[PDB]
Amino acid sequence: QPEPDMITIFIGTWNMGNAPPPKKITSWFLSKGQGKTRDDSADYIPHDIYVIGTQEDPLSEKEWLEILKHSLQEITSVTFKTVAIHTLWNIRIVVLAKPEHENRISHICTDNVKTGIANTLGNKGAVGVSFMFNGTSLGFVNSHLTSGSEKKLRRNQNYMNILRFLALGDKKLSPFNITHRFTHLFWFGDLNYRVDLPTWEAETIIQKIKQQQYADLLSHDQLLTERREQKVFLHFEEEEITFAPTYRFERLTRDKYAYTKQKATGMKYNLPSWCDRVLWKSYPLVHVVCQSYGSTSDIMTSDHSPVFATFEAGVTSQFVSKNGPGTVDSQGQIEFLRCYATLKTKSQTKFYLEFHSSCLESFVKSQEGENEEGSEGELVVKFGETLPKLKPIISDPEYLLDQHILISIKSSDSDESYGEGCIALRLEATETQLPIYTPLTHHGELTGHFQGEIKLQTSQ
Numbered sequence: 001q002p003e004p005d006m007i008t009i010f011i012g013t014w015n016m017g018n019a020p021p022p023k024k025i026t027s028w029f030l031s032k033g034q035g036k037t038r039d040d041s042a043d044y045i046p047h048d049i050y051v052i053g054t055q056e057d058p059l060s061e062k063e064w065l066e067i068l069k070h071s072l073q074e075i076t077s078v079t080f081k082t083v084a085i086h087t088l089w090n091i092r093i094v095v096l097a098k099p100e101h102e103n104r105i106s107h108i109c110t111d112n113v114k115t116g117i118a119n120t121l122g123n124k125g126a127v128g129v130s131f132m133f134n135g136t137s138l139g140f141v142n143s144h145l146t147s148g149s150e151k152k153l154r155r156n157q158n159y160m161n162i163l164r165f166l167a168l169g170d171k172k173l174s175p176f177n178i179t180h181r182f183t184h185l186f187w188f189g190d191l192n193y194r195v196d197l198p199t200w201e202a203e204t205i206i207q208k209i210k211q212q213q214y215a216d217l218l219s220h221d222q223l224l225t226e227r228r229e230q231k232v233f234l235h236f237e238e239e240e241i242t243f244a245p246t247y248r249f250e251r252l253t254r255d256k257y258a259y260t261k262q263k264a265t266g267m268k269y270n271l272p273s274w275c276d277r278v279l280w281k282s283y284p285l286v287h288v289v290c291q292s293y294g295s296t297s298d299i300m301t302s303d304h305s306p307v308f309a310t311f312e313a314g315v316t317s318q319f320v321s322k323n324g325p326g327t328v329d330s331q332g333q334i335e336f337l338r339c340y341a342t343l344k345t346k347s348q349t350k351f352y353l354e355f356h357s358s359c360l361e362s363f364v365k366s367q368e369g370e371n372e373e374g375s376e377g378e379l380v381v382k383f384g385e386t387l388p389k390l391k392p393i394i395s396d397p398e399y400l401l402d403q404h405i406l407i408s409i410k411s412s413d414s415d416e417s418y419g420e421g422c423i424a425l426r427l428e429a430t431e432t433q434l435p436i437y438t439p440l441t442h443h444g445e446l447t448g449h450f451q452g453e454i455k456l457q458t459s460q
């Protein structure tokens, strides 16, 4: 049986509003309702991996696992295997996979982050799961961020705390947060960003939703506007939204948005909003295609509607040669020419690089670069032709061209990363000098750039 080069992944996010689900939730897993929906001809085809994120989930892990597995069984006639389940308070993630994948999945990690201090520590945060699927790392984060139209800055702070402190993936990648540890990272949940229009406009907003005219509402969606201004989710993607706002509904119908201030809302308005979202970030030049993004219309136990997203995701096989793993393939090398880092830091320390990749036996430390002053104020750290020659474990170009190099630029004084980025080895040519580029981030904020040239030698 050949190993796959593609898999399909289902992502669901549902704020269940502390209520048990209805008896049938199959529309969710079938990507049926409003938005970008899945073709009827695919209904019997199982996804490879189903990742279910809930918020305000009132069920025990056992109760929810039984509903999920039963649902998938009814749709597909496949008994899914549980990869992982992790719950923080009422925030939960479930990962289910087809039984044929059981021995393709390894290195399963789970973690949680609690957001806020004192007052604000008590029910918001994130859960996550990572694992390897053959040669591909996959990470999944379900977050329930701070509620309320006037707390977008809190939400952005919650996001930064989650991507700093959630401990998933390979712990040897010590300079790197979850935004660099995975071939494919999916981040979803009740992100709680709102449509930021005046309260008085509530009935007008409802009118626009009934006409399926979302453009003037999405232009005021706080997640899109905060993303635009590089305040949150830098370098993440989201598929175009073509479904009605998923919050806040009257229960047991979808005919009514419940937006008016009530004692039960802390006297806050809940204008109709896209609270419930799926975003992703994949390494450069890896195949990832969103094939559905929408909301269900027939699941009405909560004041939110479930959201679905599905993806085609490129995967690679575990590689064994006569040489690596356990030695170098002398036929392989990665050389960096004319490289320099441009940093936003005001500090004056020396910097060195670390190169991390699963194509190396272990990470590689460079010599210190030479600091110069940029024309517009900046620190430029020059490496020239001084960077070490990297010695991959396998030289086969069908392996090596699928790999990536993670780069950290570190202070010599503190050994603290000032910036992290990623370079694809999916080059237009081998044995040829070609431009390379990555932005550098730290704690998910832009801190600079790394650019230069690469020269990759493979066995071909």
Ligand SMILES: c1ccc(NC[C@@H]2CCNC2)nc1
Pocket (backbone or CB within 6 Å): 224, 225, 227, 228, 229, 237
């Ligand atoms: C908010 C922020 C950005 C954005 N598109 C630009 C990205 C550039 C790389 N892919 C899309 N859209 C909304």
